[PDB]
């Protein structure tokens, strides 16, 4: 036997990784209705838009403004991916595992 739970805004998901100079979020944004998306960083604090999504995190550590991160999109798998620059390097961000949306 099957149930569905079913509890617009969409929250998109996404995957985390590191290394010792970035963080880097992976976007998955299949249904998005837009082509320019837009980030906004500061400190440790993310945000992503892209009609009809949008994401907030509190990120486990803070990130540089330095104009270095590294944006990119894959039009095949429908996936954002940007690499925001440690503001500590080699500060090795803990529970990413456990992150989630605000």
């Known amino acids: 036997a099957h149930h569905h ?14 290394d010792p100079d970035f963080l880097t979020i992976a976007i998955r944004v299949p249904y998005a209705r837009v082509s ?10 993310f945000k992503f838009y892209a009609k009809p999504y949008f994401l907030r995190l509190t990120l486990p550590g803070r ?19 940007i690499r925001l620059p440690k503001e500590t390097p080699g500060q090795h961000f803990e529970g990413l595992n456990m992150l989630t949306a605000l």
């Open 36 to 45: 320019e998306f837009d980030v906004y960083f500061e400190g440790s604090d």
């Open 63 to 81: 990130i540089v403004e330095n104009g270095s991160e590294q944006g990119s999109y894959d039009a095949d798998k429908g996936i954002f991916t």
């Open 5 to 18: 739970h079913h509890h617009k805004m969409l929250t998109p998901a996404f995957d985390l990784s590191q």
